[PDB]
Amino acid sequence: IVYGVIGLILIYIYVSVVSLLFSGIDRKLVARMQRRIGPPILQPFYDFLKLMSKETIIPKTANFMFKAAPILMLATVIALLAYTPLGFPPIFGTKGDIIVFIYLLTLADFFLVVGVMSSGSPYGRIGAARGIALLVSREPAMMLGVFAVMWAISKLGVEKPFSLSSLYEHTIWDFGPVAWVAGVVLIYVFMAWLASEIEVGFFNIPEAEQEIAEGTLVEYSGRYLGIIKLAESIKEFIAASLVVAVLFPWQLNIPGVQGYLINLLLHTLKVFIVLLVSKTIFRTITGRLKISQAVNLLWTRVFTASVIGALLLALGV
């Protein structure tokens, strides 16, 4: 049990170093794509410190949740790190532990919306009802794909079914010729979910657009803003780690007490290659859409393809 605390502290310090550095490389590439020098590489490690520097402002009409939601957001991200596949099988992975993952990946955004909406002026009230419509609209699209693949990798035999430690035993890519089509339909629905969860591209709706550019987080000002800008970057790393876990886990065997860190580096490199397409290219190449058009796209051209992929992969076994 005490050997499960050392991992939860050390992997947290590792991920909190790496994620901001990936964000800095991303801003440099986006700046070079349109004829610019761009900021230096470790630029977020200055913005974080100056946001912790300043004077926090509390409005006169504010609850006890204004000062306590940017604690619970970071808390349910740090507590989510212990269940994620970092390349080796996770620490607390038992027979359940998929619904705990889906529940805690849903619950952080609800803490964010409750923290924004629990203030005064009604810019936050309009910038929150736009948030939860997009939250409800993007999570029947991943449940079907992940439940279909977790059910289908349990036919050929495993001892911890419906668990993320079971996803290193056997993958999709050895079910025969018909699975090669479900592979690309599932690459489609997972890239669409990964772009719509970290909210960049078409789906840059509730962040820097409250009627022009006000945003959802128009109100948090001091320490609280620094904590929220850290927590969203850790969640950026977590969701892409899930996407590279389901799609193609191809790690080395390499027994010993140092094959763990080699597999950890190889997983970090695959995370970088998956972000590089989605976030960078899809941010540079396409603007916003709308909210009434961002809802009828995730129920028509994403959720439909999940049903096609799940049904076609069910007709392979």
């Binding site: 004829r35 810019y123 840059n204 657009e209 009627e211 859409l289 709308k290 009434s292």
Partner: protein, 374 residues
Amino acid sequence: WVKIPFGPIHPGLEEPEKFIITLDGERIVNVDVKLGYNLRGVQWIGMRRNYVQIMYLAERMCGICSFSHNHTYVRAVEEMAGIEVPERAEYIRVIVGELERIHSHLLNLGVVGHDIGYDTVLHLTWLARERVMDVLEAVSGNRVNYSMVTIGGVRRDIGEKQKRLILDMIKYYREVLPQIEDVFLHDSTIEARLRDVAVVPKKLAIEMGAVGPTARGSGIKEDSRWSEQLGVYPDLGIKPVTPEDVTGEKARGDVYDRMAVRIGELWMSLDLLEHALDQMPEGKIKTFPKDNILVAKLKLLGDGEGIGRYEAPRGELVHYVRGQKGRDGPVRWKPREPTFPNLFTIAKALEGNELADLVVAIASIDPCLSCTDR
């Protein structure tokens, strides 16, 4: 119903105003407009200055269209008192105005691309504007608010070095205009964000007197460079523009036709500047030179009415000047800006569409408020 304002101090906007809206959750049931945040009292200062000082108070009235207010005022004073203008002065005027409307259209093309996301189109069109900026800096003075038209004629001529310097940016833009022609026609974002919003019928386009590209987009062909024969404009070729030539044959003026019109006017200006550059004589530019005897003549010119009209980059503006003899300056001076009826026209074309349609509809017609609430 919820009552939220629009805010004088925003992100996105460059001028303060108040567009009050009653919103039914996500739709708009009514919108009204109040203004008066740029109210610097322009007529009241202009009532006690002499004739020369209003020529410089007039161009600082707005920043983007800073040549038009300097132009029509001189047209009005010359129409009132009676002063001839030579050929070279008029040629330089139609070079400078037609060269600055490209500067006025490109930043509008960049700002509309900023409110729908798309930082890329912003940085690339504002990189393309710099050749016109360096030309205007080389010929006149500073970048914006440049003054080179007096009561007599122009203040400096272009010479022969500026001929070489201007005949290269034409060749530079002939390789740039097809790219923004080709991006604009078929995008996944432009035709899904600025199409079928704020439709304007011809009946309300005529009865509320919409003027500029908001008018001829829905279809009413009129142009003050054409509808009155002004200067050397008739004998070098001038036509109105229509979105039928740029984008197939559509006529439904919503937002997309207005951008089609603002690209067609660039295609007209690149030839109307080209042909008018070699058709000039040599002569004089400054009817009575050495502007000392001009300040010894302000007591003598006067006793009449006067009105002047011209094509602004956003519409058709008009000034009125009445002065009386034995005086220093005028008696009454009134300017009219082209975005006054366009701002009162769109407030009914915003008849229950969306919420995020508001910025892309308002910023579609250049809400340059600095000439609106004067």
